[PDB]
Amino acid sequence: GPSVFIFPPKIKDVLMISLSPIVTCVVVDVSEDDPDVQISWFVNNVEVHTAQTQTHREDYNSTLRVVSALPIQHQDWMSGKEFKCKVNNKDLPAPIERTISKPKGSVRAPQVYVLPPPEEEMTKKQVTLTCLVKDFMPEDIYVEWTNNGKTELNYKNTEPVLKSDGSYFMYSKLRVEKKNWVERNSYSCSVVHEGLHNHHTTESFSR
């Protein structure tokens, strides 16, 4: 039968007031025999009616997928309200319900440092700039590199790793042409996290 998964908003969306956070309910293995899936939504058990719901054909295995995207208030997520989807269909013996909310826990802002290329690497054509983001809680975070404030393309992040002390850390690696590194620049590491002032910080090199 159909099964149901619930997904949180993207951390960047829920921390940036200008963005549009969404909680998503996905119903997989929907059948064309009973395709009229109903998804109802509740915020602390108060029903809301604004979700955008669409059916998609998954040709990988000839199934249907119903995706319901509920737009949410930033503060409702951040204050810990519960978001619940209730899934009804003619082929379900009983409704399926899923709930998600922001976990409780300590907040610790990340320490953000940018590290120059290793000296041994300076004889190469391309060099590596390292953004180190550490000592942060919870693990939800958004990290990017920018050049002149304009988001880069050739950067790669690690996933956050749990430390022994309970905080997390990650790195963002940026490969640049050595010419651009030696010449004066504004390569910067941008970090979006709950613990930061205005949920955002940037870090640049001194020279």
Ligand X SMILES: *[C@@H]1O[C@H](CO)[C@@H](O[C@@H]2O[C@H](CO)[C@@H](O[C@@H]3O[C@H](CO[C@H]4O[C@H](CO)[C@@H](O)[C@H](O)[C@@H]4O)[C@@H](O)[C@H](O[C@H]4O[C@H](CO)[C@@H](O)[C@H](O)[C@@H]4O[C@@H]4O[C@H](CO)[C@@H](O)[C@H](O)[C@H]4NC(C)=O)[C@@H]3O)[C@H](O)[C@H]2NC(C)=O)[C@H](O)[C@H]1NC(C)=O
Ligand Y SMILES: *[C@@H]1O[C@H](CO)[C@@H](O[C@@H]2O[C@H](CO)[C@@H](O[C@@H]3O[C@H](CO[C@H]4O[C@H](CO)[C@@H](O)[C@H](O)[C@@H]4O[C@@H]4O[C@H](CO)[C@@H](O)[C@H](O)[C@H]4NC(C)=O)[C@@H](O)[C@H](O[C@H]4O[C@H](CO)[C@@H](O)[C@H](O)[C@@H]4O[C@@H]4O[C@H](CO)[C@@H](O)[C@H](O)[C@H]4NC(C)=O)[C@@H]3O)[C@H](O)[C@H]2NC(C)=O)[C@H](O)[C@H]1NC(C)=O
Ligand Z SMILES: CC(=O)N[C@@H]1[C@@H](O)[C@H](O)[C@@H](CO)O[C@H]1O
If binding is defined by CB under 6 A, does position 129 make contact with ligand X?
Answer: no
Nearer to ligand Z, 129 or 193 (CB): 193
If binding is defined by CB under 8 A, does position 169 make contact with a copy of itself?
Answer: yes
Q: Which one of residues 4, 11, 14, 26 is an interface residue with ligand Z (CB under 6 A)?
A: 26
65 touches which of ligand Y, a copy of itself, ligand Z, none (CB within 5 to 8 A by kind)? ligand Y
Nearer to ligand X, 5 or 113 (CB): 5
**Contact letters (x/-) for a copy of itself, 73-112, by CB under 8 A?**
--------------------------------------x-
If binding is defined by CB under 6 A, does position 61 make contact with ligand X?
Answer: yes
Nearer to ligand Z, 10 or 108 (CB): 10
If binding is defined by CB under 6 A, does position 32 make contact with ligand Y?
Answer: no
Instruction: Return all residues near 162 (Cβ < 8 A) that are at least 6 apart.
Output: 139, 168
If binding is defined by CB under 6 A, does position 6 make contact with ligand X?
Answer: no
Q: Which amino acid type is present at position 2? A: P
If binding is defined by CB under 6 A, does position 54 make contact with ligand X?
Answer: no
Q: Are 22 and 9 in contact (CB under 8 A)?
A: yes
Strands 150-151 and 200-204: unpaired
> Binders of ligand X among 65-104, rule CB under 6 A?
65
Q: Which one of residues 18, 45, 59, 60 is an interface residue with ligand X (CB under 6 A)?
A: 60
Assign residue 32 a region (left: φ > 0; alpha: ψ between -120 and 50; beta: otherwise): alpha
Instruction: Return all residues near 94 (Cβ < 8 A) that are at least 6 apart.
Output: none
Q: Which residues bind ligand Z (CB under 6 A)?
A: 7, 10, 24, 26, 67
Residues at the contact surface with ligand X, assessed by CB under 6 A: 5, 26, 28-29, 58, 60-61, 63, 65
